[PDB]
Amino acid sequence: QVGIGTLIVFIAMVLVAAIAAGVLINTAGYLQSKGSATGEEASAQVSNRINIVSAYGNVXXXXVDYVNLTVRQAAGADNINLXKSTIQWIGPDXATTLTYXXXXXXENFTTXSIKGXXXXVLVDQSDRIKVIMYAXXVXXXLXXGXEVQLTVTTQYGSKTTYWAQVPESLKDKNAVXL
Template sequence: MFDRTDDRRDRDRGQVGIGTLIVFIAMVLVAAIAAGVLINTAGFLQSSAEESGEQASEQVTNRLVEVNTVGHVNNANDSGAGAEDLIENGTIDYVNMTTRLAPGSSDVNLNDTTMQWVSPDESSQLVARDTSTSGDYPIFNWTTVRDNDASVQNDDTLNDPVDRAEITINLNQTQLSTLDAGQSAELQISTRSGGQTTITLVVPDSLSNKNTVQL
């Protein structure tokens, strides 16, 4: 004789099995979505980290370094004063600095470079000669010392380790002042990528009978 109780038990077991399968599929879908979100987040964080690393590297390497700095002495004889006033009145009125790329640096465009001049008498921002806002700030000029492919002459850009440009700062400009014997000044050069170089210029204690001095 057929047992109806066993039939109901079989149907109950089938319903429980389907419910478990549905829950399992739902869990798999949720896990897949979560994994996709985690993978996307990890990729985004990796890209951000790489970009930050590149920017930090550029700030360290993409900069100019000093090769040599010379100051022009505007002494008392230039204005017709007596020889007895030569030591007292001699001042540095022009700074000529030869620069090159730092080791590992990419191209540096001088037009995109700014400088901060700090002396005992003032602090001022300097901008490139061709900058549109140069009328508001003192400017610096440059000439080519060495350039294999005319990049400095044509594009104002140092793009090779052998390139040399001489940067000239006229201290007679508004917002600047000449340096006396024994004084010092600090010059901070900042490139477009954020690389910075700080140079301390020290004037000798005596400028007597000198037209130029090493700073």
């Protein structure tokens, strides 16, 4: 008679094992997608960085009105999107964060393609894109020897900072190099 009872408990442990078995696999399924994505973005956090080749600027009257930075992919950088990037401005007067706009809209920035196909995305290593920012709209133009702190923040998080240094004298200079 004992054998009959064994079968039901036999079955009960069968599902109980499956219930116990399943949760680990579905859990491991959660981390395996979760961990893999974590490695990619963290790698993109350190690798997908932006490097400024140079930063010139047009000069009107006696004050810098434009600060154009020619940005470039860093070592091993993937397709960097500039439309999903922000620039933090730290100046003598104002101190805001600039987002991307189209065709400079004061508290924003605009990108023109110096070299390449796209005008908002760095695809290959050789493309250079110039980010236009109205210095005569985010602040009262730019005085001589004025110090601007730019922190170009990529989408993933790689922050490249820049110390903009206006020349101490702008005596008859059509365009300077900050």
